[PDB]
Amino acid sequence: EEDLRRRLKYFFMSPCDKFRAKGRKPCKLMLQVVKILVVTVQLILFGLSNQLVVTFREENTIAFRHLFLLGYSDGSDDTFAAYTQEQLYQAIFYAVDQYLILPEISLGRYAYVRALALCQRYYHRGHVDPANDTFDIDPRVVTDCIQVDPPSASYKNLTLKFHKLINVTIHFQLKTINLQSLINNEIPDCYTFSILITFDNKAHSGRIPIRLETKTHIQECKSFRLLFDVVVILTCSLSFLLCARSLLRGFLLQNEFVVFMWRRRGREISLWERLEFVNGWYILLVTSDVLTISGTVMKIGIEAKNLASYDVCSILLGTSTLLVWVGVIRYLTFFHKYNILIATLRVALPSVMRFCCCVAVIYLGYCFCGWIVLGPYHVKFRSLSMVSECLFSLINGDDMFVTFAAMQAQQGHSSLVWLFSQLYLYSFISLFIYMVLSLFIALITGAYDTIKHP
Amino acid sequence: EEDLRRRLKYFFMSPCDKFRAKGRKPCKLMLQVVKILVVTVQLILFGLSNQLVVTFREENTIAFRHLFLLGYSDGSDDTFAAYTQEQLYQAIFYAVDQYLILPEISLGRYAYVRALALCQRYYHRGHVDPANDTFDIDPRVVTDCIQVDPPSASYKNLTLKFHKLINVTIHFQLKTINLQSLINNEIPDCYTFSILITFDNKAHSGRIPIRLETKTHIQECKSFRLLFDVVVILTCSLSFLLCARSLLRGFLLQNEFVVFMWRRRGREISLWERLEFVNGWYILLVTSDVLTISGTVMKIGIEAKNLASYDVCSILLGTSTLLVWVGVIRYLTFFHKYNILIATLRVALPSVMRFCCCVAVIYLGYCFCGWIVLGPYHVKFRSLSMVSECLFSLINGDDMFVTFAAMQAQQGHSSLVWLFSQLYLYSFISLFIYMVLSLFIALITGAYDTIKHP
Amino acid sequence: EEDLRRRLKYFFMSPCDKFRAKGRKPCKLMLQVVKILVVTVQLILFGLSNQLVVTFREENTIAFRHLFLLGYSDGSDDTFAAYTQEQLYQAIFYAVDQYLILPEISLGRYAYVRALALCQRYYHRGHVDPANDTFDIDPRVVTDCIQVDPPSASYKNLTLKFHKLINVTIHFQLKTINLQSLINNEIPDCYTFSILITFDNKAHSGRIPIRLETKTHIQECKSFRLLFDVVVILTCSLSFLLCARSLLRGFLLQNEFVVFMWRRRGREISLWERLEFVNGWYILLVTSDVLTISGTVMKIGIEAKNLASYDVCSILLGTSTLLVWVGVIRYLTFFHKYNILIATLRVALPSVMRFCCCVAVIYLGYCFCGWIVLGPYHVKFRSLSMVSECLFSLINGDDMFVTFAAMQAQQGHSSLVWLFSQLYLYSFISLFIYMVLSLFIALITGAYDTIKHP
Amino acid sequence: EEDLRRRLKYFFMSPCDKFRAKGRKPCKLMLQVVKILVVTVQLILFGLSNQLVVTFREENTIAFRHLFLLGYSDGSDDTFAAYTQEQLYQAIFYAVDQYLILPEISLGRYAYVRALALCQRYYHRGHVDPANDTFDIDPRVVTDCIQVDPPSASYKNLTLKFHKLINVTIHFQLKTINLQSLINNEIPDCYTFSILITFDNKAHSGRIPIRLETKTHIQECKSFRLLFDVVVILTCSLSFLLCARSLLRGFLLQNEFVVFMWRRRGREISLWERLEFVNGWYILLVTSDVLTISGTVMKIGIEAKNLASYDVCSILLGTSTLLVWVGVIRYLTFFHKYNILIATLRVALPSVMRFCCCVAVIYLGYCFCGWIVLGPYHVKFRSLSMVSECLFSLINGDDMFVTFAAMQAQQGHSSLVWLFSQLYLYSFISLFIYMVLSLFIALITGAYDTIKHP
Numbered sequence A, B, C, D: 001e002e003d004l005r006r007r008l009k010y011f012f013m014s015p016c017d018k019f020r021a022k023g024r025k026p027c028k029l030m031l032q033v034v035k036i037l038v039v040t041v042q043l044i045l046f047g048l049s050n051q052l053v054v055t056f057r058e059e060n061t062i063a064f065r066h067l068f069l070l071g072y073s074d075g076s077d078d079t080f081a082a083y084t085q086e087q088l089y090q091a092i093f094y095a096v097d098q099y100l101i102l103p104e105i106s107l108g109r110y111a112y113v114r115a116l117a118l119c120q121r122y123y124h125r126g127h128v129d130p131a132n133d134t135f136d137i138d139p140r141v142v143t144d145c146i147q148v149d150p151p152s153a154s155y156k157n158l159t160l161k162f163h164k165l166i167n168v169t170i171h172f173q174l175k176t177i178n179l180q181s182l183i184n185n186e187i188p189d190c191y192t193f194s195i196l197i198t199f200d201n202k203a204h205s206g207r208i209p210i211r212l213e214t215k216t217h218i219q220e221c222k223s224f225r226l227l228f229d230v231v232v233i234l235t236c237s238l239s240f241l242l243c244a245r246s247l248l249r250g251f252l253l254q255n256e257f258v259v260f261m262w263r264r265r266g267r268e269i270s271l272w273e274r275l276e277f278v279n280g281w282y283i284l285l286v287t288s289d290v291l292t293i294s295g296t297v298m299k300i301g302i303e304a305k306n307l308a309s310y311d312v313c314s315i316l317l318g319t320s321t322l323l324v325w326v327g328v329i330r331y332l333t334f335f336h337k338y339n340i341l342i343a344t345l346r347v348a349l350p351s352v353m354r355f356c357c358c359v360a361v362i363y364l365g366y367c368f369c370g371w372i373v374l375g376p377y378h379v380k381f382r383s384l385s386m387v388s389e390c391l392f393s394l395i396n397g398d399d400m401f402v403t404f405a406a407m408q409a410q411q412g413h414s415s416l417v418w419l420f421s422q423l424y425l426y427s428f429i430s431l432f433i434y435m436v437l438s439l440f441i442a443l444i445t446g447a448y449d450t451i452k453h454p
């Protein structure tokens, strides 16, 4: 009788009450504090390594734009184009000539890689004739390359085909050595820059945009942190073991209560009792455990095998650290102790969540109105997604006088879309500022009263 | 006695309670779910058709600006003008010369349409003489055209009349073929671009702005969705039939109660009883029915007859989809069941709506103060409507440091409008942020308490 | 006994109750409705007259900038300067040469006014010698003019004195005729443009800014609204008579109650009874009366005598219309009737107003901290007033990422102002968003509960 | 018995009640009012002295940029660079040639200081060879100067070493005389401008940025306020004496109560009684005392010894004035009198402060997610601090449509970071606008109810 009662009472005993009664079982909570310190120190010490890499890439791409592009100002990337015929010839010829004299010009020690390959791509047999609308078009793509070697009569006399042109692309490589890595007490890693100038002509609209994308391949030239990540996986795995034993002990006393409620037979106490046995935090911490050790094993594999995709490793570690810090709030809820602190998902959280569904639908309806009506006349409403970004910017207010001014400029001079757009925007702003934010305050205040005073 | 009572009770029976008692009358609610899916799939599949058209127009207008306008940078449309005399001559002569050599320049396959017509418009007899203020002006407009044919001594030697000039306009057509429509598994539609360069001289202020408007006419050259819109009109019309029978059955039991309250004679129960009989949602859904089928019949007529005005069809379909999604909230109010959920328009909604009138008037008064006082000194307050956009931007905060800086620049150096403008703007911001948003929260919270706890 | 009681009861009788009992005393309330219509129609019909004038001025100033200034792009007014020596000579010589050939260049019919007067202003005897710090300076200003007549050897060979130069100013006039005023069914008013180019050298810092201010003088060349303003002053004056009789009748029954409370002798009922006798709205309406008729008499005097100062007339009419529209709320408070609706200034309004004093002081303290500390390092914090505009923009959020970026750029590289500026800005934003807006909601909600439920 | 009781009652007696009973003890409160006036008049009269200095510096730096830098537009400081080889030579040679003819060019009376010293800094023995990855690098820095004297064959023929270059710096001085200080009734202070042009090549990335920093040294050439600061330190020190006696008298009656509660022996009344004896404001005012007199003694020392570091003096005075104005609120709490008005730090302030900890952690977790994941692809997320500025700007809404557009531009075209970034940003905006601001309102309203109605 007595032993079965106190095991439940020891189970829901707060650890601050449990230290002042039992005395010194420290090894559980200490490694949670160690986990927060060790994971964030790994994340910061990795993040500075990326920033030292990335800005060395970002300055080199800009220095390639001022060298290989013709007439490139700064901050005008997307509206950079070649409209006439001679501008396309001049933008090709200037890009090659700046390659063949590159050691006599640039300032970083750029070396060649043994070369440059110009290549255009036109249709197999295209005949566009707008006087008779005759087309006889195989959409088969025939790529016609041309080679240029650096230390010409072969390079010039080039004939583009402006009536079936798809792409004019230039591809080459460059190798450079980081010299910042002298003082940083490391072996300077040699980089390989792979450049692909693109003269895109997909839309065939008499406007060819131009862009220049780079790509790196970091390789060591002609042991601290390697120990540190082993520290992280051992620390985090011991938490994965120990918390799993805590939850299955929670299942042990989950079933131990119910069997005792058959000899008593208290009407087979429902699902809202067995759910009151487990926890509200250890599932969050153990989900952080699996995410952390998965990202770190991927991080160990990268820096020996290949260093290209710092992408899935980044999206896993950045979520693991988020779950750790949000997992610290438990320490600030030992002071609270309302006796389950999980019935909020029965009581208060449903009445805010179906309101969140009601807000989500009305917001979706104004998306589907704005994208079709104010699509062809306005510049910021092309895709459905950019409509979603523009209306969600209008809620808090970021982009709001620019859209009324752009609406005021012409808007067709139809004076029906404009009378629609005033009635559209004023209603949508005045709805989600006043009659939605205020309902949301009334719901959360009703929740907080319902949790506290009962 | 019993049959008349239960017909009322079956009427207000919720459908989730009605399935668990009666059993399987599914055909009503199912087509509402089908309606939401079918209307939104029509709207999305139409909207992508517009975006593939519109961006092909928008790139071609920009490529016409870089070809036919002199000295056109990008993003400087409105402050593009010709101030001297030679700039107006050079902007005309350059626009014609780029037309007569257009196949040797541009990149899209632009073909002529058999031509270019330059034409100026000056007054019949105007004599402006500022030394004696003598005017003898017939405002009769005499248009003097001139023809130019492309494959000149006729084109040059042109004499403008800068003392009675109204407009110098150039009009011509261009025909091109979309070549993007090869891979999209369709017949490539040939377009016809109609260009109208405008040298406007309306205000006679020594500043002539320049702009270039295009206009398209899409025509097929030398059956999926056509079935799909027939699916929409049949689906939506069956809802228009079936919901109308539901509401007139609502009128049937509207009158059936009142006649039974004459044999009882319960003091001839008032308008707030017969209004409690109908609904709060089927009028919204049937208004979506009429709007949907009207827009679709207009959409069928467009793609065979003429394709110019995608304007009223767009403004009807974009409203119909809005009413559908806002009409989904009924499914989230079966869980609620407060026994009419329409008396809010008697109880709670009036006490927010007359407050909304009180906010609307004060906002209108600050419009009429700002437009006359801060009109002549500030750039953003010309019309009354742009004042309305500027103050409504200042409420949420979008344009707020720019207007104080523009106020700080000169503001006449009268130092009376500036002392007014500080007292104007600070009071208007501090009113509608604090003492209006907070009253609105107190009203909605009082509404939600009044609906719930009584 | 009975007659003295009902005169009080008729006094506080609402007019909607007073029509349904007494019957048809309409002439009081009708002219209030007439007042709202007539004043706003005057204000709108005057405001369109200003906008037709002002944009004709604003385009002519821009067309003067492109003609008389050297190398003027658009939207770069304040950072337009002449730094070297030859740039100051070239900006003078170009401005005069464009004046002497002005009818052969510009497009509006600009005529001369019989002329141009160049004039510089230098000190009487200034000797600046930085090798010995010797100054012997009379600050007496000696103006040296030079005349130029238009249809030169006299104009050139000009010698500026760059070691004691204060101002180089050019002044002349231009006359033009509005030709837009043909179709507008009026007599076209001839304008006189007075231009003053300024080469300011006040700060002696090796940077001379340049600006060009115009000034107009509208005069008729070689009766609807005149009646309409007489309609306004007669309408508004009859309200000034009739409401004054209403308030002095309010003083009549103010004293009639108190004398009857000496025969009763109800302990000499206090100031919060005699204040409950008058009103809360007629003082607002009669203040709108005096402001309206004052501005209109000034408006009559302007359009015959001189048309320069549309400034005090504008600041009076724009306030009168504001008081009228805010004065409409009384019609929406007949429905309310809480029996004085002025004791809010005893009950609820003091407890928000001393909180408004407490917010006003803390805001003032952060002004005096920011202007001295973040003054010399940051560009937006020069005056105290521009600090007030910048912090008040940071409250609602308009200018907030720009100031952190400007703080991040250098900020001295002292790393003490930066550590101060992070702690400054984060505390000031987080205070007035959370812990002030929320107290203000709690005060207004406490006010609304106190007014309603007691 | 009686004397011990009334000393406590006189202690908590409000001064407005204390004047109407005792009568005229004015000297305490009067100097607090004098303190507010005297400190703010010192602060304003000092702040205008800084602004007259700083704008004379800020215009001279800009006028040095247009003279000594090649091809400098305005507002383009950070993206000003030299990418090729000839641009670095031309930017050096142009900067020196504009120095050797400086009195024949500039407008302010700039004089030389007897000179210019060009000097480059390259590595001791560097060999970068990307064909074999051979490096043999001493990172020892060998500075190679070159002298130029102004009134050349020595200046030209300069050989940079582009393969081991670190810095190319030019240093010289200029002396000028303020001439604005004639009319300001003072002795004109001669300034010394020290200029350091920097051609930084730290990252070795083929992109050399260019910047020009100045530095002043104000010295008088060949008594009002000096008295005024002595007034401030004497005023503020008398407050430091008098308030200290008030607090130690507070300790005197702190111990006088407790000894009387041993003869009574009221169970040794706890820490929440002895804390109710002192104050809540005099510690704030005396902290303002020490800060004020410290900053002023530093201010006296500056204007005789050296005038460089107006930095710690500014950061102390700007905090002292803040504490004074926030210290005025006590006058508005004599009207209040809730009988301690400090138990809020026991009652209400803890339940908002641990919520402020819970908000602070979640905000920190989204920092550590955003900086690693959205680091390499986005321009505004480089450091951790600029992530903190960007997310805190997104809360109130300042930078919100720019970040979605920059996310929409490429974002790698990996379509996994983009699907992450939508889910990242939408959750973070919707959390701290709705479900945090509303909890904060519910906490402050619960605080205000708890303070008032109990």
Ligand SMILES: *[C@@H]1O[C@H](CO)[C@@H](O[C@@H]2O[C@H](CO)[C@@H](O)[C@H](O)[C@H]2NC(C)=O)[C@H](O)[C@H]1NC(C)=O
Pocket: A121, A141, A166, A167, A169, A198
């Ligand atoms: C230039 O256009 C060609 C098509 O003419 C592109 O080649 C295709 O690219 C897509 C995506 O990489 C592939 O799915 C196709 O298989 C490619 N087809 C052929 C025949 O190569 C080419 O990628 C374009 N250039 C760039 C830089 O995008």
Ligand SMILES: *[C@@H]1O[C@H](CO)[C@@H](O[C@@H]2O[C@H](CO)[C@@H](O)[C@H](O)[C@H]2NC(C)=O)[C@H](O)[C@H]1NC(C)=O
Pocket: B121, B141, B166, B167, B169, B198
């Ligand atoms: C150029 O000015 C002429 C007037 O001189 C405009 O012609 C008028 O245009 C309006 C609107 O289209 C019509 O209501 C009038 O009937 C037209 N009058 C004549 C005589 O044609 C012309 O439209 C202007 N050009 C442009 C491009 O707007």
Ligand SMILES: *[C@@H]1O[C@H](CO)[C@@H](O[C@@H]2O[C@H](CO)[C@@H](O)[C@H](O)[C@H]2NC(C)=O)[C@H](O)[C@H]1NC(C)=O
Pocket: C121, C141, C166, C167, C169, C198
């Ligand atoms: C150019 O500088 C002169 C001073 O050298 C200015 O003349 C003074 O202007 C102020 C304000 O108008 C008057 O209070 C003084 O009496 C004027 N003094 C003299 C001697 O004229 C002149 O105004 C400046 N030019 C401009 C356009 O502001």
Ligand SMILES: *[C@@H]1O[C@H](CO)[C@@H](O[C@@H]2O[C@H](CO)[C@@H](O)[C@H](O)[C@H]2NC(C)=O)[C@H](O)[C@H]1NC(C)=O
Pocket: D121, D141, D166, D167, D169, D198
């Ligand atoms: C140019 O580069 C040199 C290094 O080659 C810089 O000199 C160092 O500057 C730092 C910071 O001032 C000192 O800690 C080092 O002791 C300096 N080393 C030497 C050898 O001087 C120099 O400061 C750079 N120029 C500028 C303007 O920053």
Ligand code: NA
Pocket: A398, B398, C398, D398
């Ligand atoms: Na902005």
